[PDB]
Design a binder for this molecule. Sequence first.
Ligand SMILES: COCC(=O)Nc1ccccc1
Length: 284
Amino acid sequence: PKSMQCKVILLDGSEYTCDVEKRSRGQVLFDKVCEHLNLLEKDYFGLTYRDAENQKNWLDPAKEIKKQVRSGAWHFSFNVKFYPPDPAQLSEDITRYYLCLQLRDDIVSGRLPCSFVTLALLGSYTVQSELGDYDPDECGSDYISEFRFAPNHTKELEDKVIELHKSHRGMTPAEAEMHFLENAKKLSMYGVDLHHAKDSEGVEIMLGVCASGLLIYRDRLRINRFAWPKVLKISYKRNNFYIKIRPGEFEQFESTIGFKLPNHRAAKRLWKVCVEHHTFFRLL
Ligand SMILES: COCC(=O)Nc1ccccc1
């Protein structure tokens, strides 16, 4: 029974290696990674792989691994797939821990924009969680943390992390992680999966896919928001992505909004993430 070596980048940046039968479905590998991580609330998470074109794709747990990675290496990342709107409602601290690690990468990467003060506050909770109570013995007037807090680090940001860290004395790791999440969850790009697209006139837009629904970022003076309930139907054909929007009360007919994606694979990928978000956040 022939087995393929899988390499998974975990949210702490370490590498997990395991083997699965070469005809294995994605769920088989995912179950192994989640067991390794002692993760029970698995529904929020998934594995990604970098495709031929080099884009992030979700590994479909229901399909053969080989029919997804195709010509590529069996290399994956472990990631948050569905960002919970209220992390306080997750049943386990370890779930909230993996969500914090994902969000720290969201922030450092610049996928999750954040004010100076929120960067310093989130950083202060990470330090409290990981080192515990503020100790002046480590932190002199020239201190720079090993922790990556932001896309661009400044001495003034390092100083503000320390100032707030001092205020958190006696906070446990679970308590600091929950405070991290109460702040992170309010950020306007929290849990927003962004896709480049063109509108029906060819104007460059971004489509964001989140728990609540669909966002169309046009010019920042107008952002169109479609709550999942207002979305009747989702579809792709060629390089196009279509959404059907319900008639307001007393209107005879749904409206159609069409978008042009870079290529057919980018259209299918947006369609599948919308279907999965719609299903997940209809049930949650
Ligand atoms: C405070 O809400 C921020 C937001 O963008 N909400 C939303 C996003 C997509 C559809 C409907 C609502």
